[PDB]
């Protein structure tokens, strides 16, 4: 009867940010206060509505996007931000009405030699529109010569790995990020 936020927040694996995940929260009641007190979060910033104010509101759908990035980039998960993530991987709209939660995952997403499971998009011909998901892997032309889909000089594979190591600084440490988005439609609202 109540929303299964644990499936998203306590999921054993998280997504590469360039292939960021989305889960649909439907037909349930959302306690956005127990959620504030579910654990210690590095970030719990809402844009448009407070948690208590949200406890007294109802929306059609609630999307829970989840992925992993590094510390210095959590900033970019906000309206009006620029950087590798916001420009090329995960873009929040300026008019964003939702919440951004993030916590430190170094204890789970780093390995001694480096963890290369998590990729991000390094190059792109243009910035992302809001909530766009680019999982293409076209060779990126960085110079004046066209690449013809051949990798080579200034013709790059567009993805790149973080390589999380436990001994990195926190700015380069892995953080798990859950963006909650609120969908209000002309249809029966089912999440309150």
């Amino acid at each position: 009867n109540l929303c299964p936020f644990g499936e998203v927040f306590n999921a054993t694996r998280f997504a590469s940010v360039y292939a960021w995940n989305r889960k649909r929260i439907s037909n349930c009641v959302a306690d956005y206060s127990v959620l504030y007190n579910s654990a210690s979060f590095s970030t719990f910033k809402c844009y448009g509505v407070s948690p208590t104010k949200l406890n007294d509101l109802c929306f059609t759908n609630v999307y829970a996007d989840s992925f992993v990035i590094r510390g210095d980039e959590v900033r970019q998960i906000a309206p009006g931000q620029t950087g590798k993530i916001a420009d090329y991987n995960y873009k929040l709209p300026d008019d964003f009405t939702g919440c951004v939660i993030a916590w430190n995952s170094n204890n789970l997403d780093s390995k001694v030699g480096g963890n290369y499971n998590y990729l991000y998009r390094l190059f792109r011909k243009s910035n992302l529109k809001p909530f766009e998901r680019d999982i293409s892997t076209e060779i990126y032309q960085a110079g004046s010569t066209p690449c013809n889909g051949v990798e080579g000089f200034n013709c790059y594979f567009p993805l790149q790995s973080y390589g999380f190591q436990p001994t990195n600084g926190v700015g380069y440490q892995p953080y798990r990020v859950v963006v909650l988005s609120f969908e209000l439609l002309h249809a029966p609202a089912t999440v309150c």
Partner: antibody, heavy 129, light 110 residues
């Protein structure tokens, strides 16, 4: 008919690279986990890497971490293994293999069927001075 | 990491006989998530059984899998000449990584 065809193997000096390709046909490529599994001369199969149908999830054998990158392209019905800094002990036949699927998720983290129901013929990688 | 010990290393039997191949795990395998594969020289492995006892599609009834926890067995009730080959077990339950056994080679006794 379901088929997987690997290519891109070869001989390279230690420290070289290869770009392995796996072309799939006969099924909805996008719905299936895809994996690379290697078999050294005289040995049994060894899991190398996997990627989920939506590319959200990736994992690697501890011994290739940071040298091999797995990715896929569902529009080309294909997946790939970028191998760099090759070492002599990476010599083996490399198979791409499919795992079957179990949905409010783009790429559901609840997935445990990491067995391989379809394999390609394989492609040979030899790393030697 | 789960270690799968397959035995014996080489099994010598005649056609028509029953073959039993053992796969023991160094720790319990969750949900019986244990698969078996057959491989012929110069060929890719092919799946025989998943979930310890589920027969893969197109596999003959003479192949059956059983077991749970740390104890798994593949039985070939009536050996045909095409069944003589190498067999691998593979764990895939609640472990950091999928793991394979080192194989049991079934050869023709004469």
């Amino acid at each position: 008919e379901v088929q997987l065809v690997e290519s891109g193997g070869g001989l390279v000096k230690p420290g070289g690279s290869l770009r392995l390709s796996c072309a799939a046909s006969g099924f909805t490529f996008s719905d299936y986990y895809m994996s690379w599994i290697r078999q050294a001369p005289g040995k049994g199969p060894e899991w190398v890497s996997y990627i989920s149908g939506g590319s959200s999830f990736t994992n690697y054998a501890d011994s290739v971490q940071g040298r091999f990158t797995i990715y896929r392209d569902n529009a080309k019905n294909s997946m790939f293994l970028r191998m760099n800094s090759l070492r002599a002990e990476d010599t083996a036949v490399y198979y791409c293999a499919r795992s079957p699927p179990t949905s409010d998720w783009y790429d559901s983290p609840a997935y445990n069927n990491y067995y391989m129901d379809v394999w390609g013929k394989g492609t040979t990688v030899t790393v030697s001075s | 990491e789960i270690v799968l010990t397959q035995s014996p290393v080489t099994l010598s039997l005649s056609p028509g006989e029953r073959a039993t191949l053992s796969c023991r795990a160094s720790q319990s395998v969750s949900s019986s998530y244990l698969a078996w594969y057959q491989q012929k020289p110069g060929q890719a492995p092919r799946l025989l059984i998943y979930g310890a006892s589920s027969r893969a599609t197109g596999i003959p009834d003479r192949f059956s899998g059983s077991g749970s926890g740390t104890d798994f067995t593949l039985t070939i009730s009536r050996l045909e000449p095409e069944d003589f080959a190498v067999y691998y077990c593979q764990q895939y339950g609640t472990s950091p990584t999928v793991t394979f056994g080192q194989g049991t080679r079934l050869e023709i006794k004469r």
